[PDB]
Design a protein around this ligand. Structure first.
Ligand code: ADP
Ligand code: K
Ligand code: MG
Lengths: 304, 324
């Protein structure tokens, strides 16, 4: 079985995407070719991709989309792209039309988990705790029922984020966010707050890894009481199932005043050997080569 | 200025899509080329695409995806595909990576509006009244929180394909198996009867304008496939016979759901009216443009002639891409 690895991308996470590709290529137990999307959207195949990998940045590519890629020569595609044109369902839709099995969530789950507003609406309706938030659309004035501090983020970008401490500064933060997305979210900023992260693996019905914490060091496992550790994993699996995520997801939480809040589901998390998602499943008995093998196997299982 | 019209698809609504292409091609006020996705997934271009149209069905195609199209010839793509692979964000995602302006909703809104489970979760959270429902996975034991009669559907479907009305729990397993033939996730809704079916068209990007409210009448048990497209079988009341407050409320809820889901271009929003209570049934981001179709007739009743509706759909696509 041969695997195609697509990395880079036009998003600001182009570099960290290439760093994830280097770690995967160094440990995947399959023959794996690399294909790079340069920052200008054009593709690099063959040796120019590896050259772009070693340079850690591909500013300009060769082939405009769609690329002259021998799709039939690969059994599984691993979209290792972060952010826009990576985790938002566009590349997934292309692969769906190519008929190629691919790692990770499908079009609907990728687009939903990328939308900071619509994902919370789904999660809140399912009974999953999330931080109080409001959507603001460009032009329409904002209606914020809570008090500062807020976070003002572009809803679909995954840059333009501001921590607003005075209501006076809200119009400036919305103006900054609106130049990257027509819809913005305003989230109540919790403080003090701890960040917890847990990995899920599987198709719709996943298994949870141990919980980790970001304090920038990675506490693995996170120093959590037995009850809180369980609720984090339970809440992650529920959210994973409600959104219909496939393959994998890193589910980030907030812990404040003893309350858990689902922060974000990442369908293509950072994947260096030292990244949180591989380290969490390593702590759970799933080593990095085995983790990559299972992700490929799950891509084929869904494809029947 | 040149529009590429894409019709057909590998969804069950393939033949419905070719009918809509004929209606759009007849009145579109732009130079428009047709491309057809045959039922095997392979594309027909140029003269073969037009021949596939007169056949009213395209079983086999020539070019595998992606097709050898000169995308730089076309300023706007009009995906006139219904259902899976066309209305659910997959084709939209391809057009996004191509950098080409296209008519209709984006990736997220298309995928969300094609999922009868997730869409209702968003609408119910935003306070939009919906029918009580439950989702069921393939091979997962069904737990129906209410009592029959039911409507069992695949979560991703169109033109009433795979939908069953259930009156006994013994008939539920057979209704779910029929639904699982078209989707791995099913929905089980509480059947409303008697029910009136109200439909209203929306036009615009996120902040839309509503058409007059129309109504669907028929003698069949429900608005099924044969009723929807066999001419004369379903009768369209345009505008619908309603109180002023009722037509107003339908339009307000249509625009509200349209805005929450971030729909672009167009949508036909369908409602249930039962015992004085309204219920939003579903949103359709690529509605029909065929002779028995409600969307263009509603805007025609509202003063927007068929060529003008298609002109604004194309211009809205250009506005979003180049200016947002
Ligand atoms: N809860 C319900 N109560 C009454 N009729 C229903 C209900 N759900 C579906 N129907 C009937 O089934 C038809 C199609 O349902 P819908 O959810 O729109 O599926 P599709 O998207 O395939 O059209 C509707 O026109 C309606 O007549
Ligand atoms: K729909
Ligand atoms: Mg439908």
């Amino acid at each position: 079985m041969r695997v195609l690895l697509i990395a880079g991308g036009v998003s600001p996470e182009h570099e960290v995407s290439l760093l994830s590709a280097e770690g995967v290529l160094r440990h995947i137990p399959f023959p794996t070719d690399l294909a790079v999307i340069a920052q200008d959207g054009r593709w690099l195949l063959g040796e120019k991709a590896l050259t772009a990998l070693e340079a850690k940045a591909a500013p300009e590519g060769e082939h405009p989309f769609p690329p002259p890629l021998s799709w039939e020569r690969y059994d599984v595609v691993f979209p290792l792209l972060h952010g826009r044109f990576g985790e938002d369902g566009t590349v997934q839709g292309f692969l769906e039309l190519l008929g190629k099995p691919y790692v990770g969530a499908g079009v609907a789950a990728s687009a939903l988990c990328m939308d900071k507003d619509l994902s919370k609406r789904v999660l809140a309706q399912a009974g999953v705790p999330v931080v109080p938030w409001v959507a603001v659309r460009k032009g329409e004035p904002p209606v914020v029922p809570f008090d500062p501090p807020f976070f003002v983020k572009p809803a679909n970008t995954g840059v333009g984020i501001s921590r607003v401490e005075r209501f006076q500064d809200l119009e400036a933060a919305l103006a900054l966010a609106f130049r990257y997305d027509e819809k913005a979210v305003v989230e109540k900023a919790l403080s003090p707050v701890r960040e917890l992260e847990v990995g899920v693996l599987g198709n719709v019905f996943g298994e949870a890894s141990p919980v980790g914490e970001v304090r920038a060091e990675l506490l693995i496992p996170a120093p959590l009481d037995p009850g809180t550790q369980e609720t984090v994993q339970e809440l992650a699996l529920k959210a994973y199932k409600v959104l219909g995520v496939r393959g994998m997801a890193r589910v980030d939480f907030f812990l404040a005043e003893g309350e858990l809040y689902l922060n974000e589901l990442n369908t293509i998390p950072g994947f260096t050997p030292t990244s949180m998602y591989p380290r969490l499943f390593e702590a759970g008995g799933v080593a990095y080569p085995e983790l990559l093998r299972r992700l490929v196997e799950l891509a084929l299982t869904h494809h029947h």
